[PDB]
Amino acid sequence: SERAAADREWTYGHVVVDEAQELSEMDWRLLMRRCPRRSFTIVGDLAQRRSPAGARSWGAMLDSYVPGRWVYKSLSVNYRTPAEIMAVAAAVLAEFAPDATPPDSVRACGVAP
Amino acid sequence: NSVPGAPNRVSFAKLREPLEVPGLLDVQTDSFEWLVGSDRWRQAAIDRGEENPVGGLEEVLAELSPIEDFSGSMSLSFSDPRFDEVKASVDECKDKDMTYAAPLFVTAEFINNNTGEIKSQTVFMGDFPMMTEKGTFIINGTERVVVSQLVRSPGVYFDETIDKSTEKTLHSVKVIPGRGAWLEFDVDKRDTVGVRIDRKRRQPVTVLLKALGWTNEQIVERFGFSEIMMGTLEKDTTSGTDEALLDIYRKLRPGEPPTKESAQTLLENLFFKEKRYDLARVGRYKVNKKLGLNAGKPITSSTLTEEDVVATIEYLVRLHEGQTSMTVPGGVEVPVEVDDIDHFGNRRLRTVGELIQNQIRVGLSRMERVVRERMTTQDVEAITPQTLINIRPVVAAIKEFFGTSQLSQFMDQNNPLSGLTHKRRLSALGPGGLSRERAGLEVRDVHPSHYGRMCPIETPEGPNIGLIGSLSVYARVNPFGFIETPYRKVENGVVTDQIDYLTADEEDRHVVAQANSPTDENGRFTEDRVMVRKKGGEVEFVSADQVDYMDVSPRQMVSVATAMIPFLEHDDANRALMGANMQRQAVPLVRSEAPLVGTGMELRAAIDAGDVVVADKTGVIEEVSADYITVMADDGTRQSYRLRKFARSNHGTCANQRPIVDAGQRVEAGQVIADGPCTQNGEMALGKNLLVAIMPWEGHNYEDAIILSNRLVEEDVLTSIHIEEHEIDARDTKLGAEEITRDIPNVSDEVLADLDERGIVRIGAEVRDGDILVGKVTPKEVRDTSLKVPHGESGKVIGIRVFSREDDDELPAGVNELVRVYVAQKRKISDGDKLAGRHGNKGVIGKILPVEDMPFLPDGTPVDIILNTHGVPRRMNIGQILETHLGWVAKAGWNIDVAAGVPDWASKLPEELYSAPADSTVATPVFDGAQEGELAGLLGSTLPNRDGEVMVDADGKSTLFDGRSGEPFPYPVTVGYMYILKLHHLVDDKIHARSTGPYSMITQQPLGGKAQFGGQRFGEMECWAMQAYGAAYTLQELLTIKSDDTVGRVKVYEAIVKGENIPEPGIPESFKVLLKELQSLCLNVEVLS
C-alpha cells in the first residue's frame, strides 16, 4: 500500500470502483492507465448520478478502452426495500427523461409511509 | 573378477550387478571417433542411429561447402576426409617433443557453371592431433587433456524473477542458439510486453510481429485472450510493416542509410537464414518438445521459424497469467511452466570432439574468406583449389586450442587416479559457459538431476567448488550431449533385467527406486512401502505398484575416487570430499602395497587408466626384462611392450613400470603384464597398511598431529622418488653465439669436475644448491650465465636430453641448442610431511619415534602409527575405525565356527566368506558391504598368532605396553590396520625464508613467492594487530627498512655486518617527494621541531 500510494505509474492487479457513475472520462482514463490488465469490478447506478460529468452510458467510458469485451450484468428484482417506497420513488423518478426501469419489489408487510 | 589375472579380493556384497562398470575413458574416445568418423562409431550409430551417419568433420565441411560467389558462377566443395598413418609414436613424440598427429586430406571439387568443368584434387589440410588410447593428446611432448564442458543447451528458457524496486513478480523469455544472436522477451513491471532483439533497446513486441508480415486482425485472433498484449499493440506509434522494419534496422544500424530490401534481408539474414543463425539438432528438439511443435518429424530443418517466435510469446503470456496448459494452433498440448537452469536436461556436455569441431569451423570460415578474396582476383578456369586454398589459418586454430586454452590442460598425473579423474571431469568454465559474471552460489550447489550424472562429492577444494565436478561411473553421453544414466525397468512390481539409459528430462517423469530394495522371487519386492525419488528429488515412501524404474546398483551416483572409499555411508560428506581430493594428490612410493580392506573399484580404475600394461593377445611370455617384455601369441605374432622406467611425470612424481610375470606364462587377453607407479598385481595401491592404535600419547599427537615409528624410515615404507627437470637454451643474442662449453670464466676447477667434455654435467653425479649443471657462455668478451642448482634442491643426475640445431630436428625462433637435465631425490617421511587416509583423516607428523619407545603388543609387535581419539567424533569419519577393525580381521584371518550352525550375525554372509587366511584381502563396496553384525562377531574369530595368543578381543581392542616406562596402559586400546596415504604436501616444498635478495623495481618491495625467493605479506589487519599492542618501532621497521626504503636497507645490512647500533630515520622519508610537489604548487610547508 505504501509503495503504491506513493507512486502514479503503478500497475495494479485489480480495481474496484463503487458508485462508478461519478467519474469523469479522464478519471477512467487515469484508472486504465493504472490497470492495463483490465480487471475491474465496477459497481454503480446511472439514475442516481450526482456529478454532471458522469457517464450516462458505460459504453461511452469503456468502448474506448475495452470495446465489445466488457461484460455487463444488471440485478433485476428488488427485495430489500418495500414496494410502497419503491412506487413512491419510481413515480418521483418518473420525470426528467425517466425511461423508468423499476426493479419489482416484493414482500412489503408493514405500514405505508 | 572377470579379469584374467585378477588377484582374489573377497567381497561382503549381498547384491548382484546386472550391469558391469562401463569403460572409464569411453567419454574421451567415443567423441574423437565421432569427430574423425571412424568405422567403429559408424557401426555403433548404424545400429541405433540414422542410416546416414555423419561425423564431425563431414558435418563442418557440408555446412561450409559449396563455396559459391556473388555471381553464382564458380563453386568450390569439399568432401571425403581421410587420415593417413601417424608419422611417429607416442613414445617418440615425447622423446622428441613432437606432436601426435596424422595428415588429413580432403577432396576439393571446383565447378564452373559457365563451362561445366571440374578440377577435383585431393588437397592437404595439415596435420591433425590424435586422441591416444589412454584418452590423451600429445602436444610438443606433454600429455594434455581436453576436459569436457557443461553449458546451457540451445533453446528457449523462461525465467520468472522479482523487480529489485517494485518487488513485483514478473516474467521473461530468452532464446539462445548454438550459433547466432539471442532473442529475448519480457513482461515489464508496467504490464507492457516487449522484445530485446539482439540484446538492444527494449522496443515493443508487436513491432516484430508486424516486421514478419502480420495484420492487427492476426495479432488479435492469435492473441486477444490477453489484455496487456492488446494494450501493447495500442501504443505502437510505428504502425506499418515497413515502418517497423525501419525501426528495427534503425535500432540495429542507427542513422546509416536504410532500405526496405535491406530491412527484409536483415530481419531474415539474422534469424531465418541458416548461416548467420543455427539451432543445432538439440536446440530444434528442445524447442519442439517444449512448445508443442513438429511432433514426430524429420528434424532435418535446424533453424528458427516464424511459428515458434509466436508460440514463444504465447507461452510467455499464458505464463504471466498463470495458465498451466497451452496448445499452439495445430501443435500438441504442453505444460506451461518455468525452466530451471542448473537442471541437466537443459545443461549439456561439449565433449572434446565438439570443441575441436568448433575451432576447425573458425579456421575454415577464415580459409573461406581467403578463398573468396582469392577467387575473384585470378583468371577463371586457370584457378585451381590448391591455388584458392591456404591452410595456414586452420592449423593455427588447432595450434591455438591445445597450445593455449583453458579446457586443454596439462595432464594431472600425481598418480593414475589423478589422471583418470582429469578425464571424467565436467567443467563449468571456459569460453561458452559462465566465465566470471555468474560464479555465484546457486550454480555451485547440488541438484537432484546429479544422481547418476555428476558426483555430489568429488569437486576440488579450491575456488572451483561446484563449477568443476567428475562424471559418475555408470554414466554416458547422448549424441545431443546430454548425460545419461541407466535404470532397470519395473513392469508390475517385478524388477525386469532390461536396461534403459535415461536422461534427467525422462527420469523426472517416473518413480525411480533404489538398488537395495528387496526382492524375493525373480524380482518382486518383499515390502509394501518402498522408498523412491520423484521429480524434484522428493524422496518418498510409496506403494511398490507405483514404481516404474529402478537403479542398477548403488555407487551409481559416486565417481571413481569416491567408490574407492570404504565405509563411505559411515563418513560425513565434507570429510569424504577431503578423502577423495587427497587420494588424488598421493605421491607414488618405491614399493607399492595394496589395501587389505578395500573396495571392488580398484582393479578397473587401474586397467581403465592406462599405467598398467595388458596383453593385447593371448599367448605365452617369451622374454621378460626390466625394460622390454616379449610375448609369442597363439597366432604366432610376436608382441613387444616397452616399459617406462624412472620417467618424470608432469608433477615431479616417478613413472616406473615393473613386470609381474615369469617366462613361460600362459597369459590371456587383457591380463596385466606390468604394474605401474601405484598398482600391485593390477589394482590401485596409493598407500600402505600400517598398524594403528587409536589413543592419545604424550602430547605429540595434539590437534590432528600424528606419530610414526622409525621403521617406516628404516624399511623405506613411505619413501618416494621425486624427479626434477631443468632446461637451458643457447639462443642468439646478436653479439655472437650463446655457447655451451667447459672453459667457463675464471672459477674453481673443482666445480668443473662433474662436467663432461661439452661442459654438461655427468650422469650419476650428485648435486647441491649452486652446483653447476651445464656451462653456458653468452658473449659479452665472455660472461658466465650457467645453469646452477636452485635453492633447496639436490639429487642424482639421472640422464640428459639435448636438442641441437646441427641436426635441425626443431627449435624455436632464434635458438641453437637446448639442454634438459633430470635430477632425482629419494624423499623419506619426515617431521612435517602430510599424511592421510581415505576418510578425510589427515595430519602432519609431529614425532618420529624409535621402535623401542612405541606402544607394543604382548607378542612384541610395535605399532607403526598413533592416531588420537579426540578428532574422530567431532569430525564424523568413523569409517576409519571400521577400516581398522577389518584390517585386523584381514591381516589375521578368521574361521567362523559353523559346527553348531551359522551364527545369526552371519545369516546374510556370502559363503566363501566363512573363513580366510592371514594377509587376506577383502572388499567392502561403498553402500553394499561390511555391516556391524557381520563385523562384530567377525572380530572374535580372528585366528590366533603364531603362539596361540589372541592379541585383540571381540571389541577391537588389545592391551599395550608403554615402551618407555614398561607398564601396560591400564585400559584396553583399539588396534588394527589402516590404509594410509602420503601426499604431495611436503615440507621440503614449503619451507621458505629470506633475509635479502631481489626486488620488484615497480612497487620496489621484495617479490612475492617462493621460486621468486620473496618475502611474506605484512598486511593491514596485521598492522592493526601490531598497533593494538602499542608497538610503533616494529611497524616503522617493517614498512620502511624492509620493503620500500631503498636507502635504509643498505644502511641496515652494513650496520648489522659491522655490529653497530641499527640506525633510525632521523626524519620520516616517504614525505620528501610529496613535500617537494606541494611546495612546487606554491604552498609553504615547514617541517617543525
Side-chain angles (χ1 to χ4, degrees), chain A residues 3 9 11 33 37-38, chain B residues 165 167-168 190-191:
Chain A
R3 300 175 141 289
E9 59 86 33
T11 46
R33 191 159 49 243
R37 193 174 329 265
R38 271 79 179 182
Chain B
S165 87
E167 276 168 271
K168 219 181 268 188
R190 287 218 76 239
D191 281 323

Side-chain angles (χ1 to χ4, degrees), chain B residues 618-657:
Chain B
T618 305
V620 303
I621 304 295
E622 195 191 66
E623 293 181 355
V624 179
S625 177
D627 294 77
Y628 284 83
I629 310 179
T630 313
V631 184
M632 204 270 300
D634 292 332
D635 312 341
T637 304
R638 292 173 70 254
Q639 287 68 238
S640 193
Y641 308 88
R642 177 195 162 276
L643 306 175
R644 276 163 76 70
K645 309 303 293 192
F646 299 126
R648 185 203 175 259
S649 289
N650 298 342
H651 293 42
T653 60
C654 193
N656 164 50
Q657 278 164 340

Side-chain angles (χ1 to χ4, degrees), chain B residues 92-139:
Chain B
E92 212 163 323
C93 293
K94 285 189 224 164
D95 200 351
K96 298 276 298 306
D97 291 298
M98 282 195 311
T99 291
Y100 192 66
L104 165 61
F105 302 105
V106 161
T107 59
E109 77 159 356
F110 176 29
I111 277 159
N112 187 9
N113 279 336
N114 301 352
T115 78
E117 293 291 358
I118 59 169
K119 296 166 142 72
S120 178
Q121 291 92 17
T122 301
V123 61
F124 166 90
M125 288 294 104
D127 272 321
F128 180 77
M130 268 285 162
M131 175 281 309
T132 309
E133 62 283 342
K134 305 322 181 56
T136 60
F137 300 78
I138 295 144
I139 314 294

Side-chain angles (χ1 to χ4, degrees), chain B residues 426-458:
Chain B
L426 303 176
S427 181
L429 59 97
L434 65 92
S435 298
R436 175 80 212 170
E437 294 177 353
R438 283 137 41 186
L441 184 55
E442 291 303 327
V443 58
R444 307 197 181 235
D445 59 52
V446 182
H447 191 298
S449 71
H450 285 71
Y451 186 85
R453 286 142 196 136
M454 183 175 172
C455 201
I457 283 148
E458 197 285 335

Side-chain angles (χ1 to χ4, degrees), chain A residues 3 7-12 33-39 64-67 69, chain B residues 164-168 188-191 220 224 226-228 230-231 234 320-321:
Chain A
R3 300 175 141 289
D7 198 352
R8 62 177 295 278
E9 59 86 33
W10 188 260
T11 46
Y12 292 72
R33 191 159 49 243
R34 302 293 164 86
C35 186
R37 193 174 329 265
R38 271 79 179 182
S39 63
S64 310
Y65 297 105
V66 177
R69 315 187 261 266
Chain B
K164 165 60 166 174
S165 87
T166 53
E167 276 168 271
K168 219 181 268 188
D188 193 3
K189 65 181 176 66
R190 287 218 76 239
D191 281 323
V220 179
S226 84
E227 289 171 349
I228 62 171
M230 303 283 268
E234 301 172 353
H320 208 81
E321 304 171 354

Side-chain angles (χ1 to χ4, degrees), chain B residues 332-618:
Chain B
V332 293
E333 212 184 6
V334 160
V336 176
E337 67 186 2
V338 162
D339 291 332
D340 199 327
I341 300 90
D342 310 322
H343 192 270
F344 287 174
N346 304 333
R347 283 177 109 178
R348 79 179 281 267
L349 190 64
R350 281 181 181 166
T351 47
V352 53
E354 209 176 324
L355 309 175
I356 308 178
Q357 198 192 30
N358 304 359
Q359 280 278 129
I360 295 170
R361 187 184 268 123
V362 165
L364 290 190
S365 73
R366 301 206 274 261
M367 200 202 58
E368 180 181 2
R369 186 178 64 249
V370 172
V371 160
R372 298 203 158 119
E373 263 176 352
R374 174 172 317 185
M375 179 181 284
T376 65
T377 186
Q378 292 181 357
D379 55 356
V380 189
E381 183 266 3
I383 55 172
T384 54
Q386 292 179 357
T387 72
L388 288 150
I389 287 176
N390 188 26
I391 55 163
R392 187 174 65 246
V394 188
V395 300
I398 313 301
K399 190 165 177 308
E400 287 178 353
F401 183 62
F402 299 110
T404 50
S405 177
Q406 170 165 76
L407 296 173
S408 193
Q409 301 143 336
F410 266 58
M411 190 180 176
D412 178 7
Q413 48 184 246
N414 264 318
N415 66 9
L417 185 77
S418 180
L420 166 66
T421 47
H422 196 187
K423 299 179 196 162
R424 318 189 83 237
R425 178 164 287 181
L426 303 176
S427 181
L429 59 97
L434 65 92
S435 298
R436 175 80 212 170
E437 294 177 353
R438 283 137 41 186
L441 184 55
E442 291 303 327
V443 58
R444 307 197 181 235
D445 59 52
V446 182
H447 191 298
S449 71
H450 285 71
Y451 186 85
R453 286 142 196 136
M454 183 175 172
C455 201
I457 283 148
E458 197 285 335
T459 185
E461 291 184 355
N464 285 321
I465 288 164
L467 303 191
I468 300 161
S470 195
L471 180 63
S472 292
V473 285
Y474 280 120
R476 76 175 181 201
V477 184
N478 271 129
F480 285 169
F482 302 125
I483 295 153
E484 266 182 355
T485 190
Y487 303 132
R488 263 197 280 193
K489 198 177 183 186
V490 164
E491 39 180 354
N492 298 315
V494 60
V495 192
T496 318
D497 63 351
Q498 183 190 283
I499 304 297
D500 273 335
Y501 266 88
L502 307 185
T503 184
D505 291 330
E506 297 176 354
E507 164 169 343
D508 268 21
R509 311 198 204 109
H510 295 93
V511 174
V512 178
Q514 207 188 318
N516 294 113
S517 292
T519 56
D520 72 307
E521 197 281 346
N522 289 320
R524 280 176 198 277
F525 294 99
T526 67
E527 288 189 20
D528 60 352
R529 271 258 297 289
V530 60
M531 181 193 211
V532 303
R533 324 201 292 292
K534 281 212 187 106
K535 184 185 286 184
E538 306 290 7
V539 304
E540 291 294 4
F541 276 50
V542 302
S543 298
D545 195 0
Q546 287 194 67
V547 185
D548 290 321
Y549 277 83
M550 181 173 179
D551 297 333
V552 298
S553 67
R555 100 180 56 84
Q556 209 161 323
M557 66 168 204
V558 302
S559 75
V560 181
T562 297
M564 291 150 59
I565 297 179
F567 296 110
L568 182 63
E569 70 281 22
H570 296 95
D571 309 341
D572 217 340
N574 48 319
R575 274 318 185 290
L577 197 156
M578 282 194 160
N581 291 279
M582 278 196 285
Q583 191 181 1
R584 279 197 305 96
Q585 59 182 356
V587 302
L589 301 169
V590 182
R591 170 172 95 155
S592 300
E593 163 191 22
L596 299 156
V597 60
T599 300
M601 288 276 300
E602 319 188 351
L603 188 70
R604 284 285 297 267
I607 305 297
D608 293 354
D611 291 332
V612 310
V613 169
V614 299
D616 295 320
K617 313 162 168 174
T618 305

